[PDB]
Amino acid sequence: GLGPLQIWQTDFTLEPRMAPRSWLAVTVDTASSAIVVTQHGRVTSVAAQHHWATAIAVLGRPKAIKTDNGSCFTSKSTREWLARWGIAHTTGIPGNSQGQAMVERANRLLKDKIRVLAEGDGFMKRIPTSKQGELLAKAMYALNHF
Amino acid sequence: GLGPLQIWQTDFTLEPRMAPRSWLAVTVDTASSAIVVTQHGRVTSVAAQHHWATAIAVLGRPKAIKTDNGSCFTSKSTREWLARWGIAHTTGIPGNSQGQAMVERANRLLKDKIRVLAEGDGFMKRIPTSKQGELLAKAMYALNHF
Ligand SMILES: [Zn+2]
Ligand SMILES: [Zn+2]
Ligand SMILES: [Zn+2]
Ligand SMILES: [Zn+2]
Ligand SMILES: [Zn+2]
Ligand SMILES: [Zn+2]
Ligand SMILES: [Zn+2]
Ligand SMILES: [Zn+2]
């Protein structure tokens, strides 16, 4: 049982094609490379908690999650939510540089796939609100192919 | 590679504690017993398609899905959505009796866990709208423990 560590990297990335809920919260399980994404109207502490509750239902509970120092991830509210779950959190090392690189790469592959799938459906600018969820789901499936 | 068949059972169950989006769409992968649930305001053909797009992002694409003859699953719109995905569908045998039993059992374990987790949080009647998603996510995690 000397298998990979159950550690996640999480980040928010802006995607105007998904407006009005244009902030995409993306989590990469570093142990399997699975990706989970959710959309939100604003980046708050509560959006990050909503995102991780879903990721937890999808990937199970991690031992730890690594984020940057964005304030939605470092407020007291977030620290308490993570403590209630027993999940450890680290924002890395002060002036990390790298070490968030996997989720930054997932952010980019994700936006590219949304753009090619959207354009494939004839949406060259914003994706109609009513079509967003299924297209976000399709991009997520295309990047995991469970 | 003589491992289980990638066949899903899907159904809708009403849960007043989740009002106004009180119809829960539940899918059980019969190959692993994993469960995926989503909430909806009305049972339409489009609610079933929204539910399966999410399940597909979570469990990958199945070879087939088995449902009852509820009309949201048998309209032309649904038949076409499933055909676009290459997924086969069966509503079983005319007067099946059983053969949907796993998802009917998942419907019941699911509503029980929502009730115990809700009550654990002090919500004895409807769960506040703003608390529903995280509690639905928690019930889904509690029944899968990924
Ligand atoms: Zn960030
Ligand atoms: Zn939210
Ligand atoms: Zn970033
Ligand atoms: Zn695939
Ligand atoms: Zn039914
Ligand atoms: Zn919907
Ligand atoms: Zn039923
Ligand atoms: Zn667990």
Swiss-Prot record, chains A, B:
What does the entry list as the binding residues for Mg(2+) 3? D11, D68, E104
User: Would you indicate the residue range of the signal peptide?
Assistant: none
CC cofactor note: Binds 8 Mg(2+) ions per integrase homotetramer. Zn(2+) can also be a cofactor for the nicking activity, but not for the polynucleotidyltransferase activity.
Q: Which cofactor does it need?
A: Mg(2+); Mn(2+)
- Integrase catalytic domain location is 1-146
Domain notes, please? The core domain contains the D-x(n)-D-x(35)-E motif, named for the phylogenetically conserved glutamic acid and aspartic acid residues and the invariant 35 amino acid spacing between the second and third acidic residues. Each acidic residue of the D,D(35)E motif is independently essential for the 3'-processing and strand transfer activities of purified integrase protein.
Record's function text: Catalyzes viral DNA integration into the host chromosome, by performing a series of DNA cutting and joining reactions. This recombination event is an essential step in the viral replication cycle. Has a strong preference for using the 3'-OH at the viral DNA end as a nucleophile.
Q: How does it assemble?
A: Homodimer; further associates as a homooctamer.
Protein's UniProt name? Integrase
Species assigned in the record: Rous sarcoma virus subgroup C (strain Prague)
| Gene that this sequence comes from | gag-pol
Q: According to the record, which residues of the full protein are present here?
A: 1334 to 1479 of 1603
